[PDB]
């Protein structure tokens, strides 16, 4: 009696696989729920060296590759969550995010957690909506 | 001038009541926002004994009962958040989640928080979409 | 080949500006993703004095002003996340939330984080849906 | 990739059996396309006696039963077409029609055709939208 | 449980008053069903003089005012039906019609009926969709 | 503020060129309004010989090519209108029609008009909905 909505798992070899029985992202109707991305190199399965700035760059690259696999780019992001091992890294992570966001300004929440998977210093979750968007 | 979308509070006696002025879940349009579930026994109002594995089983059972009250099951879950008191319990919680998920693979984020309500070792939030889904 | 959905940035001078390259909220289709709000006075750019109860009041006022800028009020909220510097403040924050929620009962998650931006004791994120709603 | 929309054939034995390769109505998404109804008795398939006024009443009754089978009533109708064998019957058929469409009057077109199946004096087609509808 | 769709009667004094139990148009969700319009002067309710060409212009003007009341213009029309008293007028009415539907031409059907209300020579019905529409 | 719905003109050289200011079909959101088709050969624009049965086959073939251009087939049709030059041809045209609409029969109206363009014996209009449709 109701319409059947499209639900698609998004998969790309250009981002790491999720840790656990999870997908990199799920598109449902037009909304894309992207799993939290760490600064993990898809080729090594481990964090990139060099600390939070390098990890933020890698995490955002990983998000970007998942967005591309769903026909999207950073302009489609509507909400991000920035999870930090150290609140004092917030500015530095925001400076990296400003380099990837294609001038988009999604809503966001940010906070320091007690620990991230793989000893990460940053993890970014995102929600996007498939275009076209006004 | 715009359509009136369906918004329904989901309530079931087979899951604990939310802590505070919150509902167990809200269905709006076709999206179900499920409150974070702890390993609380609906009959005792307290955590089940035995630690994080037992609590994860109870939390997932609680999610399952809320999904059922909304006409859904684990195949409808599109995003989960796994909140942990100890990051080292992530694998063990993922092994329990693999027992309940009906082979679904939602998007996910996971991290260790400083503390959960009721001294919980695990809390799981979920977003589902009411079917049919492709 | 697909409809173009409305995406609008919500901005109001009656709430503080977001910290970083983010918007106060984004409306997309009918869903409003509200950035996490701290107990920051829009006039000072700093936390209000007096502790978590005062900060919770200010954070909720800030959410309320963002909702109003999107044509909504607290009855439109469907999911909240209550982030705390101290889990022991959960009841006190819930008592403030009960004063602002216009009897709405959204789904919710709550937990203690390691740290919030600006040394906040509380941060509240929300998802709302633009009415009319049944 | 696009959502799969609901498409259902509406069928009720309380409206006449088919006289051609046509469904009584088709619901698709929320819109209901109702076949043109004649003033035919549902049990026998024969036109009711009494001319255009009685045929109009029966045709509208038949539409009503099709609407009911789709979980609707006459308030769900948004467009009708009134096909007349004689334009002179315009006022008389309108008087019957107003008794069924008592509020939120549908959009309509009315005109005289050269002939209707079975020698009918009136045929009425309609489009409805499945509720809830907020007026 | 289903969403409650918007259904609104469209009414403007800039188009003729009703000659039957019909709304000028009904907007439902985003689709606008427009009643068949004759070449009737809105103030008097009398057909305009001059035959089919003038009646067509007036009928289209009336449609235009109904569209305007629904926040639309002729570019929102997606389907029309041109009902003629005389098939020979097909080309002449098409020449008038093309002056109003200047782009994104609607789908249409055109044919001769036996008679129209008020002795009209042309009646035009339409379906439109409320914008924004992305062509 | 409202979403911008897709509106596209459907056009195929495998169906006849226009005889008036009309699109072969208009897709809007998911609904396809198909212009009335005559039994016209697409290459020449001339009616096919053989009378109503052959004209019906050709008109339905033309609809089929328009549907194909919109990524649809006859199972996407939800409503048709069969306009006849002679009501006596009702049964014969229905026999042809059933060969194209072999399942999920559309809602329909059928009746005799006074005349069709080009002296046609039959004209068929349709509404379809772009799939996927779940019956």
């Amino acid at each position: 009696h109701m319409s059947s909505l499209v639900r698609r798992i998004i998969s790309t070899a250009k981002a790491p696989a999720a840790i656990g029985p999870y997908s990199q992202a799920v598109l449902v109707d037009r909304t894309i729920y992207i799993s939290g991305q760490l600064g993990m190199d898809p080729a090594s399965g481990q964090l990139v060296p060099g600390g939070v700035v390098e990890e933020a760059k890698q995490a955002l690259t990983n998000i970007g590759e998942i967005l591309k696999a769903a026909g999207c780019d950073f302009t489609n992001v509507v909400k991000a969550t920035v999870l930090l091992a150290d609140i004092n890294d917030f500015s530095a992570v925001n400076d990296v995010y400003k380099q990837y966001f294609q001038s988009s300004f999604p809503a966001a929440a940010a906070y320091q957690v007690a620990a991230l998977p793989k000893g990460g210093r940053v993890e970014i979750e995102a929600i996007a909506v498939q275009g076209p968007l006004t």
Side-chain angles (χ1 to χ4, degrees), chain A:
Chain A
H1 177 88
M2 287 211 298
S3 296
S4 304
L5 302 177
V6 170
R7 193 255 305 265
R8 293 176 37 210
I9 292 173
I10 306 311
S11 184
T12 175
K14 300 313 175 237
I19 307 166
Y22 310 117
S23 296
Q24 290 170 329
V26 175
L27 168 69
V28 56
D29 205 9
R30 307 260 303 246
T31 297
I32 308 160
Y33 294 94
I34 304 179
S35 285
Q37 295 305 303
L38 293 158
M40 287 174 52
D41 188 343
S44 72
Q46 212 160 140
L47 293 177
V48 299
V52 71
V53 168
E54 284 301 292
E55 291 178 37
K57 288 173 185 159
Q58 184 66 51
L60 288 157
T61 296
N62 291 343
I63 291 170
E65 293 296 337
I66 295 162
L67 286 163
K68 173 190 284 213
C72 291
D73 66 17
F74 273 90
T75 70
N76 293 90
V77 176
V78 297
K79 195 259 167 72
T81 305
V82 178
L83 306 163
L84 299 166
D86 187 341
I87 199 68
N88 289 330
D89 291 333
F90 192 22
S91 299
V93 172
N94 285 337
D95 286 344
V96 175
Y97 188 77
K98 283 149 40 162
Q99 304 184 127
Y100 280 81
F101 84 154
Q102 310 187 222
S103 309
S104 173
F105 305 87
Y111 44 95
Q112 185 185 324
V113 299
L116 293 169
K118 310 302 196 141
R121 288 159 190 69
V122 57
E123 178 179 336
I124 301 174
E125 305 177 56
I127 299 171
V129 176
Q130 190 169 61
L133 303 177
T134 54

